Structures are given as C-alpha cells and as structure tokens.
Amino acid sequence: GQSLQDPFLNALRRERVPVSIYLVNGIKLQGQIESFDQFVILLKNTVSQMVYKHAISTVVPS
Amino acid sequence: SLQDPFLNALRRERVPVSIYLVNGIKLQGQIESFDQFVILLKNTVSQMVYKHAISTVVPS
Amino acid sequence: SLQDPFLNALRRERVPVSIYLVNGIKLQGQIESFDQFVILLKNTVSQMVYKHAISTVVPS
Amino acid sequence: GQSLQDPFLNALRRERVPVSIYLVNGIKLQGQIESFDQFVILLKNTVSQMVYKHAISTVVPS
Amino acid sequence: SLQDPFLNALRRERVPVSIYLVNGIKLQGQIESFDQFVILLKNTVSQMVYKHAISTVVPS
Amino acid sequence: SLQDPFLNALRRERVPVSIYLVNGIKLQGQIESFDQFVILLKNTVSQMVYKHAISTVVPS
RNA sequence: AAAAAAA
RNA sequence: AAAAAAA
Structure with missing residues (x-):
C-alpha cells in the first residue's frame, strides 16, 4: 500500500x-512539503507550487 | 483533493502562471479550465495541456 | 469533460492543429478522430498518436 | 473506449x-503488426519483437 | 495475453535477448523470470528491470 | 510476485544495490524499505525514490 | 522524430 | 541529477 510513502x-x-525534490528530468526543486494527496505534492518556498508525483524521481531532506 | 482547489x-x-512540462519546457498563461486529465491554458489562444506531461504549476 | 468537447x-x-509531443517534436494536421487513449491525426499521412506521448494540443 | 485504437x-x-512505430524517445521501428493486446504490440520484421504501448508515440503506415 | 507467452x-x-529501455539504453542477457511489473534479466548477476522503463524486448 | 521477494x-x-533511474542517473545504497509505489534507499542520506522513475535494481 | 549511449 | 530550451 502507501505504508512507506505517506508516513x-x-x-x-x-x-x-527543508526538502529536495528531484524531477524525472534531473531538475532539483527545493522547499517545504506543505501538503500532498494521491497525485500531487504542494511544495512551498514562500510561493506554493503544485508538483505532480508522476514527474518526481526522488524526495530527500535537503 | 488538493489539485482541483x-x-x-x-x-x-x-x-499568471507557469506550467513546466516533464521535458523542461515552460508554458505561460492563465488557467482557463481543467478536468481529470487536462488543463486549458489561455494566452492568445486556449491550448489543451495533458496533465501527464506536466511537472509543476506555479504562479509566474 | 473539458478534453472531449x-x-x-x-x-x-x-x-488545423499543432500537437507537441513529449520529445519536443511538433506534429501538424487535423484531428480525424480520437478515443480514450489515442488521437488520429491527418496531414499528408494518417497517423495514430498515443495521448501519453502528447504534451499539448494547440490550434495552429 | 478503444473504438479507434483497436480497429x-x-x-x-x-x-x-508495413508500419513505422515511433517511440517516445524519437526512435523509429519498422515492420508489420503481427498482433497486439492491451499493453503490447508484436512487431515482426523477420524477427518478432515485443513493443510496450507505453513507449510508443505514434503508429503510421510506412 | 501476448506478453507472458x-x-x-x-x-x-x-x-539471448536485448531489452531496450525508454531512454535508449540496451541491456542484454537471458530472461530468467517476470511478473506483472518486472522482468528479471540474467547475465553475470540477475537484475530486476521495471516494465514501465522498457520500450522493446527482442532476441539479440 | 517476483518483484517483492x-x-x-x-x-x-x-x-549494496545500484538503482538506475530513467534519466540515466545511478543511485547507490541499501534498500531500507519499499511499498507499492516507492523504495527508500539509504546511503549517506535516506531518500524516497518513486518506482516510476526507476529502470533497474542491480546488486552492486 | 538518430532499429535504439549496460546506464 | 542544470528552480526548469512556448516546444
């Protein structure tokens, strides 16, 4: 299930x-995880931006 | 749950928004509408963007 | 649906439409037909394009 | 449904x-459609090779 | 229906087989096993290949 | 399953494993845990990798 | 739209 | 692993 991803x-x-989110194309975004659902993560770094999980390779603490 | 709002x-x-695609391309315009699978992005004309092709959506 | 209309x-x-693919290639033609997963695009040839390979559909 | 794709x-x-199958990375394969199911197309050109539909951009007569 | 056989x-x-990945990389070895989502490809060692990453499987 | 075992x-x-990603980048570490969609890979850092971004998992 | 950069 | 080639 989501027994790893959600916690x-x-x-x-x-x-x-503070996290780094590496996209599948190698681009690294930085910010804080504001919230998430099944399909997206909201990544906040003063501005709130919506990141599709399908485009994410990895999430790591910065 | 969070996408639609x-x-x-x-x-x-x-x-005014930037939509960054999975291949790195930045599209800019206004969100006109959206459904389960697509976002309509308006600039001079409305173009239909597939969500599967998008990495991020952020104010420009 | 916004997509289907x-x-x-x-x-x-x-x-006349431009279909941009995920690899950056731009196809041009008319939408002959479509279903859940594919679009039939006609120019000098008639070609079945998978929607998963499409980023955008833009009126030319 | 599959009212376009299957016919x-x-x-x-x-x-x-004879068909051209362009992959999502731009590589063009050529051959004949031997058979297909929900997930794959078998593309025959003396040898039978299995192509995942997820990797296909377009299929066009050559 | 056709994949498994x-x-x-x-x-x-x-x-001896070649597995070509979506990013163009060719892997070579023997098909050792497979399930819904993966193929085990044996050469010196067995590596697990995700099907979502594969474009084609062809005899080498 | 072949994947889970x-x-x-x-x-x-x-x-020790090498995880090759779809962009050609090789990650190295130990599989700390995994579920349906992600793998937790540990080296000097602990990182959640989406399986959809992985091509192969190879014993190093 | 490089019949395909064991990465 | 180029906070991102309106392609």
Whole structure:
C-alpha cells in the first residue's frame, strides 16, 4: 500500500524539514512539503507550487 | 483533493502562471479550465495541456 | 469533460492543429478522430498518436 | 473506449501493411503488426519483437 | 495475453535477448523470470528491470 | 510476485544495490524499505525514490 | 522524430 | 541529477 510513502511525506510535512525534490528530468526543486494527496505534492518556498508525483524521481531532506 | 482547489484558485484570481512540462519546457498563461486529465491554458489562444506531461504549476 | 468537447470541436471544425509531443517534436494536421487513449491525426499521412506521448494540443 | 485504437491496429495487421512505430524517445521501428493486446504490440520484421504501448508515440503506415 | 507467452518462450529456450529501455539504453542477457511489473534479466548477476522503463524486448 | 521477494531479499540481506533511474542517473545504497509505489534507499542520506522513475535494481 | 549511449 | 530550451 502507501505504508512507506505517506508516513515519509507526513513526517517531512509535520517537522517542516527543508526538502529536495528531484524531477524525472534531473531538475532539483527545493522547499517545504506543505501538503500532498494521491497525485500531487504542494511544495512551498514562500510561493506554493503544485508538483505532480508522476514527474518526481526522488524526495530527500535537503 | 488538493489539485482541483489549487488550479481553481489560480483560475478564480486570474493569476499568471507557469506550467513546466516533464521535458523542461515552460508554458505561460492563465488557467482557463481543467478536468481529470487536462488543463486549458489561455494566452492568445486556449491550448489543451495533458496533465501527464506536466511537472509543476506555479504562479509566474 | 473539458478534453472531449475541446477535441470534438477541433475535429468537427477541421481546425488545423499543432500537437507537441513529449520529445519536443511538433506534429501538424487535423484531428480525424480520437478515443480514450489515442488521437488520429491527418496531414499528408494518417497517423495514430498515443495521448501519453502528447504534451499539448494547440490550434495552429 | 478503444473504438479507434483497436480497429486501426487490426486493419494494419489484417492487411499486412508495413508500419513505422515511433517511440517516445524519437526512435523509429519498422515492420508489420503481427498482433497486439492491451499493453503490447508484436512487431515482426523477420524477427518478432515485443513493443510496450507505453513507449510508443505514434503508429503510421510506412 | 501476448506478453507472458512472448517472455516465457524466450526464457524457455534460453534465447539471448536485448531489452531496450525508454531512454535508449540496451541491456542484454537471458530472461530468467517476470511478473506483472518486472522482468528479471540474467547475465553475470540477475537484475530486476521495471516494465514501465522498457520500450522493446527482442532476441539479440 | 517476483518483484517483492527480490526487493525483500535485498533489504533483509542489506545488499549494496545500484538503482538506475530513467534519466540515466545511478543511485547507490541499501534498500531500507519499499511499498507499492516507492523504495527508500539509504546511503549517506535516506531518500524516497518513486518506482516510476526507476529502470533497474542491480546488486552492486 | 538518430532499429535504439549496460546506464 | 542544470528552480526548469512556448516546444
């Protein structure tokens, strides 16, 4: 199920950990996980931006 | 759950937006409408963007 | 749907379109027909394009 | 539904039309449609090769 | 319907194969096993290839 | 499943692995955990990798 | 739209 | 692993 993905993202969100989100094309976005659902992650770095999970390679604490 | 309100808020306030595609290309315009699979992005003309091709949507 | 009426209008009105693919290649032609997964695009040839390979459909 | 895709491919198969299959990375394969199902197309050009539909951009008569 | 028998025939006859990935990379070895989502390709070691990453499977 | 036993063996035996991504980048580490959609890979950092971005998992 | 950069 | 080639 989502027994890894949801607790991993929730912890980053709860703890306001700065993250790097690497996209599948190698572009690295930085910010905080504001929220997420089945399909998207909202990545906040003053501005809120919506990232499709389909375009993400990895999520790592910065 | 979060996708629709995020896109709608941009449409509602006519926020100029950037849509970055999975291949790195940046498209700019206004969110005119959206459904399960697509976003209509308006500039001079309305073009239909497939969600599967999008990496991010962000105010410009 | 926003997608289906958009494609149907383009198809019925025989509107010249540009289809941009995920590899950056631009196809041009008229939308001859479409279904859940594919679009039939006609120019000098008649070609079945998978929607998963499309980024955008733009009136030319 | 598959009201376009299945009759398009079946006609190519039935009529033994030489086809070009462009992959999503721009590589062009050539051969005849031997058969297909939900996920793959078998492309025959003396040898039978299995092509995942997820990797295909377009199918066109050659 | 066609995928499983195609892969199995290659495994059964120990046919040396090429698996071409969506990014153009060619992997070579023997089909050792497969399930809904992956193919195990054996050379010196067995590596697990995700089907979503594969364009084609062909005898080498 | 062939996938789950393969990943589980790698995880339990703390086998160093190379994960090749769709963009050609090679990650290295140990499989800390996995579920339907993601793998947690640990090296000097602990990183959640989406399976859709992975081409292969190779014992290093 | 490089019959295909064991990455 | 180019905070991102209106293609």
